[PDB]
Antibody
Framework: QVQLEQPGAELVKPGASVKLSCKASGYTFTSNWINWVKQRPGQGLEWIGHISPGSSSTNYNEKFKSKATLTVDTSSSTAYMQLSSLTSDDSAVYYC????????????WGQGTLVTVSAAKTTPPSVYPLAPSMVTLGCLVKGYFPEPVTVTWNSGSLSSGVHTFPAVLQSDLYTLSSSVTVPSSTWPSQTVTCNVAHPASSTKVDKKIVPRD | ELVMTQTPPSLPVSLGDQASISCRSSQSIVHSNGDTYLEWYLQKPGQSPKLLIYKVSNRFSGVPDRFSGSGSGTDFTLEISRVEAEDLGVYYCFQGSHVPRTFGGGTKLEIKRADAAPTVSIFPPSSEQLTSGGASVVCFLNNFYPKDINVKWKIDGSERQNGVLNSWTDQDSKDSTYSMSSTLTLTKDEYERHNSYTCEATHKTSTSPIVKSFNRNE
């Protein structure tokens, strides 16, 4: 299984640089070109460029010539994109993708790295349970920075019945929540746990929903 | 540079209908090897994009057959021959024949489906949040259609609009419905002076709102 692994998030000060990583596995790294793309949130894709890990040779979209540098480390199977002196215009998701030879530029995509460019510090979320023939439970994920957070229920095994709501910015912090609906014979007798990942601070929080007393 | 133009930018379709999306390239897109590298990608809400069609008309591994691409020269087209809820998202054409490689601006496929009233749920602030000094009251209005809806909060019966934050999901992949959460954020002092809290949902499905409420005491 072809995998392109990108970190979830990077917080960057204005004027600083980042180096984004794209670790490949599931095929020989040197066999396929790597492409990179920029997507401002809610906005449509742009092509930054591509690199041959075999030969290290590159082609850039002119628009990015002086913002982006592509390299690879063959020994670790990892492709890098270095972005220089960041500006709020650079805040965006960045995807790496694997080219299928003479077929398509993005046969496989990484999950993308959300780069927030800001002077603000990282703040982890507070995670609060929402308890009351179907029952609805939830998680309130409050007061974090930057985006994103990831929410699952029972470690992904509760997939259907789930709504995770886009975050809303307020007072310079994000708040999100998630609901899950389960048969009333599942809860409270089985445990229902929300799993919150906030990659920019490498926090994971499991919150069990217990009945109020 | 190859400018790729997609129309429409938004495509509303009923479930089971046919959908057609077109892409126009500002010049020809034949690669020196003879191949026309026209690709179609689909990006579902929250996810990275995924390859649908490559080389104008070939289905990528494990893409269903209700997807097919066609065209030539500068006019390319994507047909979805019987649309379902999992097909929601933004569709992009892309040319990989000439540097710099370029994407179309995207076409957003929307599902239109029968109306549906929201299932509304209200949640008291958690005991953990109270001990911390804050108090949020949360209301889910789940699985309703169409996207338009109003929520109204009431404290002891008096309407309250300060400190309310609302969020809508994107259309749901199983259901084609929308949901929204509404959060009333207060201080533990403010929360604790008042007794009943109400969430009211008004939606095209009824003249009378769905009302869900609770009392601070028990």
């Amino acid at each position: 299984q072809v995998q392109l692994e990108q970190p979830g998030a990077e917080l960057v000060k204005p004027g600083a640089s980042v180096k984004l990583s794209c670790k490949a596995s599931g095929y020989t790294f040197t066999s396929n070109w790597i492409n990179w793309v920029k997507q401002r949130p809610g906005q449509g894709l742009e092509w930054i460029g591509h690199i041959s890990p075999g030969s290290s040779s590159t082609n850039y979209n002119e628009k990015f010539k002086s913002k982006a540098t592509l390299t690879v480390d063959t020994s670790s199977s990892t492709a890098y994109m270095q972005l220089s002196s960041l500006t709020s215009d650079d805040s965006a998701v960045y995807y790496c993708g694997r080219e299928e030879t003479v077929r398509a530029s993005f046969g496989n995509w990484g999950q993308g790295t959300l780069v927030t460019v800001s002077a603000a510090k990282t703040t982890p979320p507070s995670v609060y349970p929402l308890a009351p023939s179907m029952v609805t439970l939830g998680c309130l994920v409050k007061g974090y920075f930057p985006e994103p957070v990831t929410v699952t229920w029972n470690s992904g095994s509760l997939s259907s019945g789930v709504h995770t709501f886009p975050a809303v910015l307020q007072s310079d912090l994000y708040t999100l929540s998630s609901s899950v609906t389960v048969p009333s014979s599942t809860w409270p007798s089985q445990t229902v746990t929300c799993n919150v990942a906030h990659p920019a601070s490498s926090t994971k929080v499991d919150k069990k929903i217990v009945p109020r007393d | 540079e190859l400018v790729m133009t997609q129309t429409p930018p938004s495509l509303p379709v009923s479930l089971g209908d046919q959908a057609s999306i077109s892409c126009r390239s500002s010049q020809s897109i034949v690669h020196s090897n003879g191949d026309t590298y026209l690709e179609w990608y689909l990006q579902k809400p929250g996810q990275s994009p995924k390859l649908l069609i490559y080389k104008v008309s070939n289905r990528f591994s494990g893409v269903p057959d209700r997807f097919s691409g066609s065209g030539s020269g500068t006019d390319f087209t994507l047909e979805i021959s019987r649309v379902e809820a999992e097909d929601l998202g933004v569709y992009y054409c892309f040319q990989g024949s000439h540097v710099p490689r370029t994407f179309g601006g995207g076409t957003k496929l929307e599902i239109k489906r029968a109306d549906a009233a929201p299932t509304v749920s209200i949640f008291p602030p958690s005991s953990e949040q109270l001990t911390s000094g804050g108090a949020s009251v949360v209301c889910f209005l789940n699985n309703f259609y169409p996207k338009d809806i109003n929520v109204k909060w009431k404290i002891d019966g008096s309407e309250r609009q300060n400190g309310v934050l609302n969020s809508w999901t994107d259309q749901d992949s199983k259901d084609s419905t929308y949901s929204m959460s509404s959060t009333l954020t207060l201080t533990k002092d403010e929360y604790e002076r008042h007794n009943s809290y109400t969430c009211e949902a008004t939606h095209k499905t009824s003249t009378s709102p769905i009302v869900k409420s609770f009392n601070r005491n028990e």
